[PDB]
Amino acid sequence: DVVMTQTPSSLAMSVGQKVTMSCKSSQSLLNISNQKNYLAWYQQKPGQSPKLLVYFASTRESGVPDRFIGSGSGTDFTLTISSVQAEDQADYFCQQHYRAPRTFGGGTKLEIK
C-alpha cells in the first residue's frame, strides 16, 4: 500500500533553468537503524529502459551528472536539475525500496523547449 505520488504529472521548462519535481510516499521510507531513506530516482528517454539517477535519496549513480540532485527525507522527496539541458527531456519516476511491494511513482513528464 505504500503509495508513491509524483508531481507535477508534466511540466514545460526551458534550457538552462532549475527544474524541480517532487515525489511523496504515504509512509516514511527512512530506516530508523541506518538513517538512510530508501528512495530512488530514474530517467527514461524514448524507447529506452529507465536508468537510475539517484538512490538513498541523494546518492548519484555513476555517470550521472552533478546537475541532478536528490534531496528530502521521510515522506517528501525532490529531484532537482540545477541547469537543464535539452537532452534532459524525459520521464522521471521515483520508486520506494523500503517495503515490499517496491512501488513506483506515476512519473513526471519533463518537456524541454
Partner: protein
C-alpha cells in the same frame, strides 16, 4: 559496457496459458547482487513484480503472488519469472534489474522484453 542483463520471452502468447521469461546476466556474480522483476505498460505504468536476493530469499508482489514464481541459477547466471493465468491485461515490457556494489554501477537495468498476450 561489460555487464548485461538480457531478458528473453515468448513475444506473443495466448491467454490463460503460462508466461516464462529468462533474465540472462553477464559480468557479475549473482550471489553478490539482487535481481528484481518489473514490468511497464502505457496503461498500468511501472509495476514491481518480485525479486530474489543474492542469498536465495524471494519476495513477490502480494497481488500477483499467487500466479507468480521467481527462481535462479547462480551457475548459469540466470533468473526466472513464471506467471500463470495470463489475461490480456498482463501485456507489458518486462525487465529484470539488479542491484549490488563492486561494479562500475550499483544498478543494471536490462533491455526489456515485450510480452503481448493476445
Amino acid at each position: 559496457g561489460q555487464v548485461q542483463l538480457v531478458e528473453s520471452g515468448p513475444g506473443l502468447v495466448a491467454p490463460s496459458q503460462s508466461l516464462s521469461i529468462t533474465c540472462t546476466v553477464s559480468g557479475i556474480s549473482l550471489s553478490r547482487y539482487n535481481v528484481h522483476w518489473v514490468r511497464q505498460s502505457p496503461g498500468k505504468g511501472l509495476e514491481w513484480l518480485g525479486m530474489i536476493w543474492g542469498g536465495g530469499s524471494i519476495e513477490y508482489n502480494p497481488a500477483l503472488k499467487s500466479r507468480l514464481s521467481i527462481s535462479k541459477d547462480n551457475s548459469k547466471s540466470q533468473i526466472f519469472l513464471k506467471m500463470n493465468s495470463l489475461q490480456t491485461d498482463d501485456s507489458a515490457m518486462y525487465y529484470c534489474v539488479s542491484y549490488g556494489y563492486g561494479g562500475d554501477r550499483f544498478s543494471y537495468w536490462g533491455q526489456g522484453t515485450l510480452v503481448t498476450v493476445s
